[PDB]
Amino acid sequence: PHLFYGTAQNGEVIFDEREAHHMRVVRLKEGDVIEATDGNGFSYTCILKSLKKKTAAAKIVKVEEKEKEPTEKLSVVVPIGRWERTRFLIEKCVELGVDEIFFHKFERSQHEISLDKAKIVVREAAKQCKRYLFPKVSFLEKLEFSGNVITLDLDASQNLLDANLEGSITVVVGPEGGFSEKERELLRSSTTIVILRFETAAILTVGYIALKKQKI
Amino acid sequence: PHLFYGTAQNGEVIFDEREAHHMRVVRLKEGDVIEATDGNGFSYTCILKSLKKKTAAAKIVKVEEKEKEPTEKLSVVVPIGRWERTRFLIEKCVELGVDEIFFHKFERSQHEISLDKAKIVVREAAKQCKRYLFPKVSFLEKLEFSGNVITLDLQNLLDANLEGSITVVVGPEGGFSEKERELLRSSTTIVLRFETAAILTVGYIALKKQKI
Ligand SMILES: [Cl-]
Ligand SMILES: [Cl-]
Ligand SMILES: [Cl-]
Ligand SMILES: [Cl-]
Ligand SMILES: [Cl-]
Ligand SMILES: [Cl-]
C-alpha cells in the first residue's frame, strides 16, 4: 500500500514529475484507485486519470482528515552540514514526530542547504512513515529561543534522563566540528545541555524526548 | 588510531590473518606502535615486530585496564533472522553496552547463524567502537527464563521496571507465534522503522541502567 503526495484543488489531486516517476515504478495505470496526502493532514482516495512523463492527476472520491496541528510543538534545530548527516537528521525528525525543523549554520560549518531539497527529503520520508501532516522547515538566523530548550552536545553526553521536559521543547542538535565558545556560552546560559556514534545519539536523544512528549 | 584484536602471551600479542590483512590495508609496517585489546577489558600498547601474510606479532610495551566485568548484567536475546537485521542488532548490542547476546531462532524464522560469524561482527564492531571487554555470544535453545526478563515487540517501556540484572527479548520479524506469546507471558514481563526502534529501545534501557 503506497502513499503518494500531491496538491488537492477543484476535486483533483495533481502530482509533479517526481511522483509520476514513482507511480510508473509501481507500474500504475489510468483507472487505478490510489491514496495521496497533501502533507497538511489530509488523505485523498482517488482514481488515476492521467499519468504522463512529467505530471499526473487523479479524481478525488473520498477525503479524510488524518492528523490535526498539535497544540504543543516539538522543534529541532538541525545543523547545516555534510549532506549525509543533514539528510539523516531530517529523516529522523519526520520519523520521530518532530513538528518543526530549523536549519542553522553553526560557526564552524561552511555548508549550505537547499530548502527545496530538504522538503523532498521530508516528503519522501513522510510518504514512507505514512505521516499526513509533514513537519515545516525554516531557516534560523540566531540561537535565540523561547521556552524549554535542550542542547545535544555531540562531543559530550550529559544527563538526558534528568532533564526537565515540561511544555513545548526545542532540541538543538550540535554541529559536527563542535560548538564554538561563543555558541557554547550562548547555549549554556539559555538551554539545558546533554560518547556515542552520531546517528545513535541523535535517535536516542530526540526519540526519548518524542516518547516522553508522546509525539510517538 | 586503530585498535586491533589479538591474543596476549608471554610479553607479545599475536594476531590472525583478519588482523594482519587489516594492518596492511591501513599501511602499518614492522616497527610501528600499535594498540591491541584482548577482548577481556585490557589495552596493550605494542611495537609491531612481525607482519606476515597469515599472522602478526607485536611486543607489549604497556598494558592498561580499560573495562571490568559489571556487577549487574544486561543480556539481550537476538532473533536469528535475515542477516541484515541480525548484524545490526549484534552491532547495537556491542555499542550500547549489552554484556551478553543469546541467539534464538523463533518459530517463524527459518534462518541459521554460525557463532564464528557472529563473533567476527562483535570483533569488528568492538574494534571500531573501542570496546575492550567484548560481549559473549551463545545460543539460547528455549525461551525459558528467570530474573527480570522483559519482552519487546519493536512505548511505556518508560514505565518498565529495569532494576537488577535484566534480559531483553527482541521479537522476530514475523511476530511471536501463539505458543511463543503464551510461553513468554508465563515467565517474562511484556512491555517506527526497525533500526530506529531497536536503538531507541535498547538504548533507553542501557541508558537507564547506566551501561552507556
Ligand atoms: Cl556534503
Ligand atoms: Cl543542499
Ligand atoms: Cl534555499
Ligand atoms: Cl555541522
Ligand atoms: Cl526474525
Ligand atoms: Cl572473532
Side-chain angles (χ1 to χ4, degrees), chain A residues 1 3-13 15-26 28-29 31-51 55-67 70-127 129-141 143-157 159-161 163-168 170-180 182-184 186-187 189-194 196 198-211 213-216, chain B residues 1-26 28 30-127 129-135 137-154 157-162 164-178 180-212:
Chain A
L3 173 70
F4 304 100
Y5 165 79
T7 307
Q9 62 216 64
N10 303 293
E12 73 191 328
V13 179
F15 307 83
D16 68 1
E17 176 165 357
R18 165 168 290 265
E19 292 307 287
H21 179 252
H22 165 208
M23 293 177 170
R24 265 188 305 293
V25 137
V26 171
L28 303 176
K29 31 169 200 173
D32 292 359
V33 166
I34 61 181
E35 192 191 356
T37 179
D38 55 2
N40 314 128
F42 294 83
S43 174
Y44 308 85
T45 304
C46 317
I47 311 195
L48 189 55
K49 305 172 309 204
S50 132
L51 183 49
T55 61
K59 200 155 179 320
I60 304 158
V61 176
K62 194 178 164 91
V63 183
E64 304 153 276
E65 183 179 38
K66 229 87 185 184
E67 283 163 45
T71 343
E72 119 183 324
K73 314 246 182 304
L74 174 61
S75 303
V76 179
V77 176
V78 173
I80 294 166
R82 287 189 300 113
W83 177 248
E84 320 92 85
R85 284 165 80 95
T86 307
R87 181 195 161 63
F88 174 80
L89 292 171
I90 298 165
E91 277 173 4
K92 273 38 219 167
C93 283
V94 179
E95 217 188 324
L96 298 171
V98 169
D99 299 302
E100 307 231 13
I101 309 178
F102 293 90
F103 292 115
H104 189 252
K105 193 207 195 147
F106 290 82
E107 283 170 2
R108 288 179 187 177
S109 177
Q110 313 181 209
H111 288 87
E112 300 293 329
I113 189 165
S114 169
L115 212 71
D116 286 357
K117 194 173 299 106
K119 294 182 192 281
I120 292 166
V121 174
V122 165
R123 181 216 291 211
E124 293 297 0
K127 283 155 51 174
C129 287
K130 311 288 208 252
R131 176 159 176 197
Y132 294 85
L133 176 65
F134 290 1
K136 314 305 187 196
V137 298
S138 303
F139 297 112
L140 178 67
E141 191 68 1
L143 294 172
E144 285 173 359
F145 314 105
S146 81
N148 206 339
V149 193
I150 310 286
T151 299
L152 172 51
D153 185 8
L154 295 166
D155 299 343
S157 205
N159 204 191
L160 181 65
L161 300 187
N164 182 69
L165 300 176
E166 289 295 281
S168 258
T170 302
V171 188
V172 175
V173 179
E176 184 181 13
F179 301 118
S180 66
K182 229 173 251 206
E183 293 170 327
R184 203 175 273 287
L186 221 183
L187 291 165
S189 86
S190 74
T191 85
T192 294
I193 319 197
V194 316
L196 287 167
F198 158 76
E199 290 193 359
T200 303
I203 286 168
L204 196 61
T205 298
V206 176
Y208 169 71
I209 288 157
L211 252 183
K213 288 303 218 194
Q214 268 128 249
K215 294 283 176 186
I216 47 174
Chain B
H2 302 92
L3 176 64
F4 300 99
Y5 164 62
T7 300
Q9 54 182 50
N10 299 324
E12 73 181 356
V13 183
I14 70 170
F15 303 95
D16 67 358
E17 190 164 352
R18 176 172 284 283
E19 301 298 301
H21 177 66
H22 186 190
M23 292 178 177
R24 293 184 277 282
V25 175
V26 303
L28 284 176
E30 295 164 0
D32 296 338
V33 176
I34 60 163
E35 187 185 1
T37 176
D38 57 9
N40 302 138
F42 293 80
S43 156
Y44 295 78
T45 308
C46 312
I47 298 164
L48 184 59
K49 288 300 173 169
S50 174
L51 174 58
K52 298 200 209 188
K53 195 272 191 178
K54 297 185 188 185
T55 66
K59 182 183 174 55
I60 299 172
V61 166
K62 205 182 89 176
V63 177
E64 186 175 349
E65 187 171 67
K66 291 297 211 176
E67 284 169 39
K68 308 181 205 220
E69 206 68 61
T71 328
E72 143 178 320
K73 304 290 185 287
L74 171 52
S75 308
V76 174
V77 180
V78 173
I80 305 174
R82 293 190 297 103
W83 172 255
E84 290 71 28
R85 290 170 77 94
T86 311
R87 176 175 195 149
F88 180 84
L89 293 171
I90 300 170
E91 298 180 326
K92 292 316 102 165
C93 289
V94 173
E95 168 186 3
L96 300 171
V98 170
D99 296 299
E100 188 156 12
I101 296 168
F102 292 98
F103 296 111
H104 186 60
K105 190 206 81 65
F106 285 87
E107 266 169 18
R108 299 172 179 182
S109 172
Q110 294 320 301
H111 287 94
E112 277 187 304
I113 198 177
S114 150
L115 286 187
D116 280 6
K117 193 181 177 184
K119 290 172 71 191
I120 282 157
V121 174
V122 172
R123 188 213 291 212
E124 296 296 2
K127 285 157 54 175
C129 286
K130 313 270 190 140
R131 176 154 177 194
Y132 293 86
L133 178 66
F134 296 178
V137 299
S138 61
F139 289 119
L140 177 65
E141 304 294 309
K142 301 186 168 197
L143 299 168
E144 294 180 347
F145 309 95
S146 60
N148 206 175
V149 187
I150 62 165
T151 289
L152 296 176
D153 200 330
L154 277 34
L157 173 67
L158 296 186
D159 289 312
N161 175 26
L162 300 180
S165 303
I166 204 149
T167 308
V168 187
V169 185
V170 177
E173 185 173 17
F176 301 107
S177 66
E178 189 174 62
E180 287 169 337
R181 296 186 294 266
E182 287 162 347
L183 188 56
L184 286 170
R185 282 179 173 78
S186 83
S187 72
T188 75
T189 302
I190 302 322
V191 292
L192 250 51
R193 293 174 17 111
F194 157 76
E195 292 194 357
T196 313
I199 289 170
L200 181 55
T201 301
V202 181
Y204 172 65
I205 298 177
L207 188 71
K208 199 151 162 207
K209 299 197 79 39
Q210 277 158 75
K211 301 261 171 202
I212 61 187

